[PDB]
Symmetry: C2
Amino acid sequence: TIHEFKKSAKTTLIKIDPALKIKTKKVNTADQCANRCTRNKGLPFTCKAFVFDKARKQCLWFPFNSMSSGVKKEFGHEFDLYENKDYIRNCIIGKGRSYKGTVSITKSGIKCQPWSSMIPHEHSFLPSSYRGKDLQENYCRNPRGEEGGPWCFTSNPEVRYEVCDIPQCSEVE
Amino acid sequence: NTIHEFKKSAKTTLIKIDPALKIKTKKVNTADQCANRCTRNKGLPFTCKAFVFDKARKQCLWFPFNSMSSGVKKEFGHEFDLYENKDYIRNCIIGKGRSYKGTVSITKSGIKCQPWSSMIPHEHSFLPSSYRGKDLQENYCRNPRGEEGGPWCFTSNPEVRYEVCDIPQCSEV
């Protein structure tokens, strides 16, 4: 069940609007948080994300995620944030500068190379060098808002980089 | 086994009016094998957005498109099941979400939706047959009449006839 979630290590969320619902429970593993979140049983809201506190082995279930208004993304070595994919916009606006979904395949079907790897292709697009751009794993991203839309360095040495095939939000009715 | 991650439409395949579109096929044993290959996108000269399992011919058909793509239409067939990759079904709402086709099936307060085909717990006349085009399938949040509230559903709690679902707007600044 944990695979329908995008994971951000060392991250938790804090509500700034105190009327937003939360629910917590001491649990054993992060997989058990995902299960309860996926089946949404016993939660007085739509679970959109959860955090696992690895220190206290506690789940925090939320009716919001990191893109929700009135919530902050904070660093914490004991936390892992898990965002339900159904609530991370899966289409692109303009050139997709703000795309944060989990698609990792190019238009012609090649698997993307992780942004933190220099083979097949060497580059200067490190996470460190692009704060806020979410250059995590091998996700299609568009850090500089360039023409093509989200793209990635391709795991095929013959093709340096190729755009992905993430649809425009305007594509369909 | 990634098959339960797809939006399933029974008795359905897709045909391309557009001769340019690429499809890929392979004789196989079970529908899970089509799913596994779509998820992994291995050996496909394109991004797999949907697949069909043909139960009679024991074949997978993999598509770089889905039932919402232009230049494609549905075709009825008892031997066919269609599986659409949720990553390519727009998961946010435009306007009132008349055209929402995503799979969120829980209300704002966390109540599992009642199936549109069921009169239990609530009797109603939003039968799929009265609302063709509106995809009143399974128990998905829908707004078949395009009302102010956004997508909604009859509720599995006998005390709550219906409630709106909490699906984000694609773009609202």
